[PDB]
Structures are given as C-alpha cells and as structure tokens.
Design a binder for this molecule. Structure first.
Ligand SMILES: CC(C)C[C@H]1c2[nH]c3cc(OC4CCCC4)ccc3c2C[C@H]2C(=O)N[C@@H](CCC(=O)OC(C)(C)C)C(=O)N21
Ligand SMILES: CC(C)C[C@H]1c2[nH]c3cc(OC4CCCC4)ccc3c2C[C@H]2C(=O)N[C@@H](CCC(=O)OC(C)(C)C)C(=O)N21
Lengths: 572, 572
C-alpha cells in the first residue's frame, strides 16, 4: 500500500492578520488505519485538509511525500476525500449517485457494463444492497438512514479505487452503534491494504481499540505520533497517571485541557517514538472526460434533482396559474374609455414586476449547491464551465420558460389585449426575457456566497430601485437629467416599455369621438400613440426591439459576472 | 432538603396517533445530585420535563410527590429550571439579567438593596465576579464565553432560592474542561443541601464520579435507579462484563445499544434496588407582582435590547433616510401639467406600499423571542397581557413612529406637495397608521410560530394581493361586483386613498386653461376633483377619515388576533 510520509509541516493563514495553525509536525502513516485526535480548535481537520491538498500550497511550508515521491498533480483525482456533512444528492437514489460518480471520475473508454459491475462491487462492499435503489432523502420525502447516507458518501469516493482514502469526521453527527458500524466497515476496508486516514472527535474505547496509528494534535502542535496501543504507555512514562474505568482518548484530551502545550510538546521531542520517526523520514527523503460529457451528466443530475424535489418546482407553477386566473378575473374585459389607459398600464406593470420578483427564487440555485460544487471541483469531476452551463440548461431554462408561457396564455385572452397573432408572441417573449434577465441578475449577485438572506435582500433592494424607473410611477421625461441616466440599468423599464409599445399602438381611448373638440382640446390623451409619446417611448419598431436587445445584453453580462464569480472563487 | 419521590409514572402523547414515551417509572431523589442518563430517543428529557411540570397534566398518569405531599400550584414559581440552549439576553449584561429576574420573580415588598445583595450573593456563588458587568454577547458584539453564559442561565434561576433545581442538559454544547467546571460548580451547590436534578448526554468518568444518584432510561422504560457507584456493580451482577479502560456511562449506553429492552427492564424488577425503592415509596405515599410592574420591566428589557442591538434598528433608519432622499431627488418639484397626475399618484403609491413592505421586519419580533417567552411564562415572570403590551410599547411603537416621520419630513418639501399646515400632518399620520396596520398584520400572522420564513412569505403574498386593490394598478370601479368586495381588506388601499384625497383637492392640472375647450371636451381630467371622482373616491371629508378609522379597526383586530394566538399557544 501507500506510505504517506509528511515531514516538517509548517502552515500559516491570513485571517490581514497572519497566524500559524500548524507549527512543526512530522509523521509517517502506514498502510492500515491512521487516526488524528485533538480538540476542535486544534489542527486536526487542518492537517487532514493539508495532507489531501485541500488547502492552498501558498501557506504550506514542508514536503508532503507519498511512497518515496512528492504528490503529483493527479493526486486529488486519485485519492478520495469524504466530507464531514454528507454531500450526497438527497433526491437521487443510492445507485444513481454511484452512477454519477462513475460517469465523471472514471474514463470515457470503459464500458457501461464495467462501470455497473464496479458500482455493484462497491455497493456490495458497503452493505447497501438492501437499500441499493431507494432514495437518499430530503425534507419532503422520507429516505435512508444517516449511517447509510455516510456509507453512500464513502462509496462515492470508493469508485475510482483510491490508494489513499481520507475522512473528515466519520463519527460525528451519528449515534453510537451507527458510528461503531461505520468504523468496523472502515476496518474491513483497511484490512485489504487501503490506507485510511481520518480525523475524529472524542471517540469511545470500542472505537479506540481498532486504531493502527495515532496522531494527537493540540493548538497547532504535534503531541503524539506512534502506534495507538503505545500511546497510553507513553503518557504513563511521561508522568500522567491514568485512572481506572476511563477512556484513553478522553484521557488524552484531559491531558490537553489541564485536568502547558509548549511544555508538553517538548516532551515528545525527547521520545523514542520521535527519533525513530526521524530515522524513518530522513531515510525516505534523503480533463479525464470531455466537455459535453460533463455538461450532459451535470444537467442530467440537476434535472433529476428538479423532478425529485417536487414542491419548489410544482408550487411555482401552481401559484403562477392561480395568480394568472386572479389577474384574468380582476382585469376582465379591458374597455376602451378613460379607464383603459389605467387598466392596461397597471396590468402590464404588474406582469413585469411579477416576473422580476418571482425571479428572486433563483438565488437558491448556486447557494444550496455550494459545498457540493467546491468538493466536486476539487475532486475533479467537472470544470467550472460545464457545471455552470449544465445548471443553467437544467434549472434555469425550463423553470423560467414555463411560468411566462402560462402567464401569457392565461391573462392574454381573458383581458382582451391587442387581438393579433404576433402581439401575443411579442408579449410572451418579453415576459420570458424579463424573467431571464432578472434571474440572471439573481445568479450574478448570488453566486459564490454561502447564505441566502443577504443575497435575497440585495435582490429586493435592486428591484425596488428599478421599479421606480420602470415608468408607471414617475414619468421618465420629468426626471432631472443628472439622475435620468439610471433608467437604463432597470430591467422592468425595458420589459414594461416593450409591453406598452406592443399593446398601445392601434388602440383608441375616446369612444364616439370623431373630432368633436377639434383634436380634442390639447389635454385629452385619446389615441394610444399620444399616450405612448408623452411617456418617452419611441413609436418606431426599433423602439420595441431595443428593449429586447438591452435585455439580451443584460443576460449576457450578468451570466458572465456569475461565471467569473464561480471561477474566481476561493476553492480551498 | 426536599425529597422528590415519583411513583408509577405512565405518560403518553398524541403526535392523532397516541404513543407512550414513558412506560412504568418510579424513583426517589434525595437531597444531593441526581442524574438521568439514556439515549436521545429515550425518555430522559421527557421525564425531566414531567418532574418539573413542564409537560401537560393530561398525559401524566402517576403521582409526583415532593417531601410527602403532592406538588402545589406554586411549584413552578418555586423550583428553578434551566433550559438546554441558553435563554439569556445576549445584549444585556450579566448583572442586568439577574436584575430582571430579581425584579419579576421576587416580591414587590423587598427593598432594592435586598435584591441587589441577593444578586451579589448569587453572582459570588457562581464565580462571575470578574465579568459581572460585561455584555453576554450576540453576533455583532463580542461577549462572555459559553460556560459563563451557562453560569448566567443557572444564576437567573438561583435568584428565588429554589428548593429543587432542575437542569436540562448542562454539559452539551460545551467543551470538556468547561463542562467539568460547570459540574464542579453544581457539586459545590449540591453540598449546601439543594436538590439538583439533571439530564445529560454521554458523560465522562470525571463527570460520572461526582454523581449521588443515577436514573437510566431507555425507550421510555426505567433501566436502573440507585446510587451511581452501585450501578456498575449491579450490571456486573446482571451478567454484562465491563472491560478495562472503559467509561462506565458509555458502558451503560453500550448495554442499551446491544454491543432486548423488555428483557433488560424485567431484570431491574428482580433487583434489590427496586424492592427497597418500593419499600421507601409505599412508606411515603401510604400573580406575585402587579400588572404595571411586569409591563414596566418587560418594556425596559425590550427597549434595552433595542438599544443594545444596534444594526437592525439603526439600518432601518439609515435606509429610510437614503430612500427618502432618493424619492426627493427623483420626484423633485412636482409640476402641474399632464405629468402631474402620474407623478403624484406614483409617489403616493410608492410611499404606502413602502410602508407596508417595510413592516415585514416585525415578523421577527414574536418569533425570535418565542422560547424565552415560553420559559418565562411557565416559570411565572409575567402574564401574557403584560408581555404583549410591553413588547408592543417597546419595539413596535418607536420603530414605526420614526420612519414615517422621516419619510414625511424629507419627501414632503422636496417634492412640493400641497403647501398647507394640516395636509403635512394628515400625510404623516396616514403613513404612521399604514405602518402600524401592516405591522399589526405581521404580528397577527407571525405570533406563536417558530420559523420566520413561512410567515414572511405569507406576509408578502398578502401584500401583493392587497396592492392590486390599492387603486393605482386597476381602477376600483371597473372591477366586477362579485370581486370588488375584496378592496376593503387591503391596507394600501386605505392609506393610498387617504393620501390621494389629502393631496388632490386644490390642484389644477391644465395650465393656461380658462375654459378654452368648453369644460374641456369631456376627456381632459384637468382639475384634481375630476381625477379623484373617477377613481371612486369620495370628496367629502368623511371620504378622508373613513380610511383612518378603517386602519384603526384593522390595528385593533390584528392586535387582538395576535394576543389570542399568544394566549392560546401550547406552552408545554
Ligand atoms: C407570485 C406572487 C404571488 C409572489 C411573488 C411576488 N410577486 C411580486 C410582485 C410585486 O410587484 C408589485 C405588485 C404591485 C406593484 C409591484 C412585488 C413583490 C412580489 C412577490 C414576492 C415574491 C417572493 O417573496 N418570492 C417568490 C415566492 C415563491 C414561493 O416559493 O412561494 C410559494 C407560495 C411556496 C410557491 C415569489 O414568486 N414572489
Ligand atoms: C426600504 C426599501 C428600499 C426596502 C423595503 C421594501 N420596499 C418596497 C416597496 C415596494 O413597493 C413597490 C414599489 C413599486 C410598486 C410597489 C415593494 C417591495 C418593497 C421592499 C422590500 C422590503 C424587504 O425585503 N425588507 C424590509 C426590511 C429590509 C432591511 O431591513 O434592509 C436593511 C438593508 C438590512 C436595512 C424592507 O425595508 N424592504
């Protein structure tokens, strides 16, 4: 098996206040089962991220060396890593998660039969054969238990057959017998020859008896490294008395807590386990798949997540149908009189600002899947471009095509707007474009963040500063010229101007008029063009289509900003 | 000290699926230190809530009897209880929390000097004298450490000098040496003669050596009850071998988990610790303060929380000032021409719907303080009426007086609305009333819930169904008569109709007119009354003030519904 042998690791971060969180740590990890103990504030998870190259090589100041050689560039694609909180797809089943991982991690050369036999072998080694085709589970659907979720998360990284297998906290978040079952599974894996390296948090003695090698850390300093049976005898030789009926790992943490660390670290420097470790270390020292493949599998997984998550996709269509029927019931039969201007301008304003505010629910998209994106980009399933285009083609495109089609098909013929063939399609296309543009601004603000609330609030602030310049509330010509340049940044202004220019052309709003008051008395606003001029809207068809080309340019700019915020994200 | 002696407790709930979660449990708890162990799904916290009467007496089916007598009605006011997650005020300091608890729990007869000496004695017994006047801590301000938060939460219930002191999970959420310090403090309390009863979760042996009496529970059934030293010897006599270097409490849980419960519970029936327990049990068996006082102290605490939480109170005023300057910059100098109707109706619609949507942030009020309200109502600090009126007088009144005054004083004179003395005050009062009414609907929907998101979403749905019937988007006379009755339920319609009737009276919107087109040609909308009639608004001053009396009636109805949802809440 592999022998991961790290020597003289110094590590430091910038919080810019610079601080070392690993001081001077060396150790050898045999084929077998290696554990890392310590407090939460100690460097256990930090050293585990360092050995798997999950933290940046800028702060790292020592050689990490496997089997006599430094770590190659293919190492992250070769060595599996299992996150603390499970990153499995809750809506997909256990076999389709392994199908996804086998499709992206393994080569394109292999047969589907070979990958299916590999998945069957991995799901046989885990004991997930009873639940091989059930869903993993979310809030709405009941699913598989938590220990078998953890076995699924291990089995996703077992597909590529890793030589070294890392594990961040496999015990925590679980109950006791569940944790014992997971660790017995890990011991059955380690007896084969696979080198398991894991960090944990306050284990039991039934856990602690299984360990092959131990590494204790405290406040960034190495406290012990050797065989795990030898550790209690070493701390008896240090002078700390162990009491009867006490867990030795709890005794190890009780040494740290003080019933000092610079006093206790130097005691390990004067050990027999330290000179032997240096005597071993100085002996040793002195993409895969194409683009369309990744886009196809990412889009397939995200669309299957969209189907398997019923409520957040169905309820938007239900509220769209209900609100379309309500707007068809309120504005039913739009007349041509003095109320016609107010009713038509009001319903077009409601439809555009409805599209904008209903596109706030795409903040959720790149924020819920953020840790899964980071883990699967470091583990090397996909590029950022394929993730981005697949998740636009999967979750953004149909869930913004369907509500605008439903709004136009419902509120068009109940209201009785301009009864032409092409005005219907221009209205449908304008609602679709304002939906895409508002949702693209949502993705531009929301991408690369961890919380939903600040991005949602900022979307709503931007929309209430856009709807002032939309054109119904204020007249755009009466804004002062040092402030009227902000009307070009606003998506409802383009959607609403396009709908007003679509609908107000052939209409007359003074019945029985036939020039009674001599082109009626200069204050009438009778024909639709006379309304559409004094709003500041052009009458030429470029005055229609420049709104759509402005929306298309805002879609392109906002999706490019979202892509750059995903690409320039701190992945480590 | 007190001897809490419970006998033959049977307990069951309705989830309506009926299920027993405590089967047949009896035990005696001496003056000293009593611990309750078990799994999470076992009845440890349920039995601890039963003994402190924190669960309803409907499901309870056995006598709980202290010191030879059943529990009186004053018992909850006499025996302290400490919640798992701390319910201390994060923005108040450690001395003012104890001042609050001493003001509400103790009598009105006692001197302020006596209560201050009691607080000094309690804060001396805890070891909080170094941090006696520092703030406890929230997200924005750094504060006291978590163990000293837990000591503060214990000291809040130590004020009334309880004979019996309960504790739900004093170890969890903490680190190891912190938990050992808290439990050594508890042992120093228990040596005085105070009867401490607590539930915990997987303790250490340094914890477990301190116990005076033990009660193990599993799946609703009693597993052991006796002295805690005797428990390991009893389970050796049962036939379960304990291994060396193993925590006995972890061994107790490992017996439960199965390395059955109906097999193992009957073994305790055949004990020597069970017949002795029955031989002891059958021997034994066979507001404070006025209303204005509670309202004053609750309002004082909530106002000090409003000051000590800076950002959520200051940032609303900052965004109000910024948005008032923006609306004063866009709508600057409202002219009297064909654009005057559109600009005035637009800015009045923006102001009213701004008041409505800015009153969504009072959903937070009764939802963040929900567990603190439940704990302090059961422990008996205040009635529901005093809590409700104090938290309306503290957080609702000034944070809705200030933004409406700021909006009116900024956007009034920059826009140049109706330049009178009383129109300014009618506008300020109408914005204040629409703020109160929207926020009262927020309190009516939000009170008695635990999550913020569903209540916030429902507030926003109600507001977007109200702003259609406000009157700018649709004309209210052109709505069909089977659906035009919904316009009376909408708060922006009353605020916006009152502002339009306030501002559109003395205005003329056709310059240089002087009857050129013979009362100009029937389609002009020149004078303000001609606009204000065709919207459906009365011209008499009752057409102004009926909007304000409708807003006052909606304030009264919504605050009454919020009070009934607080009063009829399931407190157990
Ligand atoms: C679809 C609508 C009922 C809710 C939608 C929405 N329209 C708005 C339109 C606005 O214009 C104003 C109307 C008069 C002039 C301007 C202003 C605000 C809004 C909002 C709120 C917004 C939101 O808060 N987010 C999603 C919620 C979708 C959801 O998940 O909720 C269900 C019920 C579970 C499906 C949304 O679509 N709305
Ligand atoms: C204050 C304003 C900028 C945000 C406010 C608000 N106005 C609205 C007005 C609306 O009329 C439409 C205008 C054209 C026709 C109808 C519609 C929606 C809104 C919203 C959103 C709402 C919100 O989502 N939340 C609260 C508190 C937010 C907050 O506390 O923000 C800081 C930055 C932390 C201080 C709010 O104030 N807004």
């Amino acid at each position: 098996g592999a022998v991961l042998s790290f020597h003289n690791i110094c590590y430091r971060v910038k919080l810019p206040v610079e601080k070392e969180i690993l001081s001077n740590i060396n150790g050898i990890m045999k084929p077998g089962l290696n554990a890392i103990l310590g407090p939460t504030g100690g460097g256990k998870s930090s050293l585990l991220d360092v050995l798997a190259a999950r933290k940046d090589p800028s702060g790292l100041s020592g050689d990490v060396l496997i089997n006599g050689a430094p770590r190659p560039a293919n190492f992250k694609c070769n060595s599996g890593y299992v996150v603390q909180d499970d990153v499995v797809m809750g809506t997909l089943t256990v076999r389709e998660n392994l199908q996804f991982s086998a499709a992206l991690r393994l080569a394109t050369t292999m047969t589907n039969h070979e990958k299916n036999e590999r998945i069957n072998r991995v799901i046989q080694e885990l004991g997930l054969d009873k639940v091989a085709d059930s869903k993993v589970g979310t809030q709405f659907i009941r699913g598989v238990s938590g220990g078998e979720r953890k076995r699924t998360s291990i089995g996703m990284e077992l597909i590529t057959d890793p030589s070294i297998l890392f594990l961040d906290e496999p015990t925590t978040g679980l109950d006791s017998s569940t944790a014992n079952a997971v660790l017995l599974l890990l011991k059955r894996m380690s007896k084969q020859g696979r080198t398991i390296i894991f960090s944990i948090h306050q284990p039991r003695y039934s856990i602690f008896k299984l360990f092959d090698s131990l590494t204790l850390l405290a406040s960034g300093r190495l406290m012990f490294h050797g065989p795990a049976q030898e550790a209690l005898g070493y701390f008896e030789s240090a002078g700390y008395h162990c009491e009867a009926y006490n867990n030795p790992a709890d005794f190890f943490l009780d040494i740290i807590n003080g019933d000092l660390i610079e006093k206790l670290a130097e005691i390990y420097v004067n050990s027999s386990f330290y000179k032997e470790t240096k005597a071993e270390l100085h002996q040793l020292s002195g993409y895969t798949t194409s683009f369309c493949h990744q886009l196809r599998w990412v889009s397939k997984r995200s669309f299957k997540n969209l189907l398997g998550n019923p409520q957040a996709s169905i309820a938007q269509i239900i509220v769209t149908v209900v609100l379309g029927l309500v707007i068809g019931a309120i504005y039913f039969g739009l007349k041509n009189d003095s109320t016609g201007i107010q009713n038509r301008a009001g319903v077009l304003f409601f439809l555009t600002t409805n599209q904008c505010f209903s596109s706030v629910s795409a903040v959720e998209l790149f924020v819920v899947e953020k840790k899964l994106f980071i883990h699967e980009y470091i583990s090397g399933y996909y590029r950022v471009s394929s993730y981005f285009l697949g998740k636009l083609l999967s979750d953004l495109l149909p869930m913004r095509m369907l509500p605008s089609i439903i709004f136009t098909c419902i509120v068009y013929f109940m209201l009785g707007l301009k009864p032409k063939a092409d005005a219907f399609f221009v209205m449908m296309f304008t609602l679709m474009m304002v939906a895409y543009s508002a949702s693209s601004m949502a993705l531009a603000i929301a991408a690369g963040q961890s919380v939903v609330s600040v991005a949602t609030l900022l979307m709503t602030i931007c929309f209430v500063f856009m709807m002032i310049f939309s054109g119904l509330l204020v007249n755009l010509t009466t804004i002062a010229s040092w402030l009227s340049w902000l009307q070009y940044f606003s998506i409802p202004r383009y959607g609403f101007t396009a709908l007003q220019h679509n609908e107000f052309l052939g209409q007359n709003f003074c019945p029985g008029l036939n020039a009674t008051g001599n082109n009626p008395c200069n204050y009438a606003t009778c024909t639709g063009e006379e309304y559409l001029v004094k709003q500041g809207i052009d009458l030429s068809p470029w005055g229609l289509w420049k709104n759509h080309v402005a929306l298309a340019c805002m879609i392109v700019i906002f999706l490019t900003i979202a892509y750059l915020k995903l690409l320039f994200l701190k992945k480590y």
